Write a protein that binds this ligand. Structure first.
Ligand SMILES: CC(C)[C@@H](OC(=O)[C@H](CS)NC(=O)CCC[C@H](N)C(=O)O)C(=O)O
Ligand SMILES: [Fe+2]
Length: 328
């Protein structure tokens, strides 16, 4: 299997005020988005070793009792409000992966969207503080650290498409973003049950099948164990691991807005028998955010696609992904 072209881009100028330097970064983002659709953001400023250590401390100490008590509705019928946020249990002998998802920390009981019971907005659930000291505070601060990197990346994507730097970022706000963090644990298992291993049409053993992301962009930290593959014209190629950077790609909302100039790359997760972490941040806008679709390949920039509100896109996208590739 050939290695996919995944450039490392120094995104540090996107946090500053050197406009020329920002345009040179935007060009790199444009090139990577038009090629394989993936790049590693380096010089991003986030302490990813600490993220990995705090996540490991949580995954390895949470107990079965706590998992039921934090479980989403798919695993625990008592928790009807938990569609997105909470614990996603493994099923020994059948399903290896397990994870913990949380949303905007500003979705509190008094938030207007929580009061209106608007779909896709939920109040986060957390384990007991005495059992996981400092975890909630760490995780909430991580959300804001990765939100800040994502705002900087969105300035780069906007400039890359010929827009002003706040084109996307003006719709990505702390008070209403639907962005989520998922702390995924992929375990080492001896024996590794065959029921938890899927097989692609090309014979590749997988943990998660081909898909496009449900996001504007996806900002991912993963352990140093190679696992992702991206479909290109030359076939599926391996994305090398880099546990010092963030792997960035576009989701189908970006493909919609750009009339597929920046496609949402199709990718999948190979089966690897290794204890590792996959920690995505899905950059989602607000429920009512609507960006008018355009086409940077057309002289007048017009598109034959209709505006789609982010909330509608997200609710239906998450359900469709579960229908296609299974409840995680
Ligand atoms: C490919 C990486 C990102 C990861 O997959 C994933 O995270 C997969 C495919 S992108 N994503 C999802 O299942 C969507 C989770 C959405 C989250 N519950 C939310 O409510 O916002 C993996 O399996 O390692
Ligand atoms: Fe994905």
């Amino acid at each position: 299997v050939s290695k996919a072209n995944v450039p490392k881009i120094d995104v540090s100028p996107l946090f500053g005020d050197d406009q020329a330097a920002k345009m040179r970064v935007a060009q790199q983002i444009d090139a990577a988005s038009r090629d394989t659709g993936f790049f590693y953001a380096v010089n991003h400023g986030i302490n990813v070793q600490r993220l990995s250590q705090k996540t490991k401390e949580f995954h390895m100490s949470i107990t079965p009792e706590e998992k039921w008590d934090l479980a989403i509705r798919a695993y625990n019928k008592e928790h009807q409000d938990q569609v997105r946020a909470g614990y996603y249990l493994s099923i020994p002998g059948k399903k290896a992966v397990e994870s913990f998802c949380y949303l905007n920390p500003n979705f509190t009981p008094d938030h207007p969207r929580i009061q209106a019971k608007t779909p896709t907005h939920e109040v986060n659930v957390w384990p007991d503080e005495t059992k996981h000291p400092g975890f909630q505070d760490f995780a909430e601060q991580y959300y804001w650290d990765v939100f800040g990197l994502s705002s900087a990346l969105l300035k780069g994507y906007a400039l890359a498409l010929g827009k002003e730097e706040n084109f996307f970022a003006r719709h990505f706000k702390p008070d209403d973003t639907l962005a989520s963090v998922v702390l995924i644990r992929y375990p080492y298992l001896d024996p590794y049950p065959e029921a938890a291993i899927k097989t692609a049409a090309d014979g590749t053993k997988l943990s998660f099948e081909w898909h496009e992301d449900v996001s504007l962009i996806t900002v991912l930290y993963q352990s140093n164990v190679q696992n992702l593959q991206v479909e290109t014209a030359a076939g599926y190629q391996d994305i090398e691991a880099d546990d010092t950077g963030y792997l960035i790609n576009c989701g189908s909302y970006m493909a919609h807005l750009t009339n597929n100039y920046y496609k949402a790359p199709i990718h999948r997760v190979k089966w690897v028998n290794a204890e590792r972490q996959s920690l995505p941040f899905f950059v989602n806008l607000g429920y009512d955010s609507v960006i008018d679709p355009f086409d940077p390949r057309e002289p007048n920039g017009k598109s034959d696609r209709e505006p789609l509100s982010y909330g509608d896109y997200l609710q239906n996208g998450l359900v469709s992904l579960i229908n296609k590739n299974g409840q995680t």
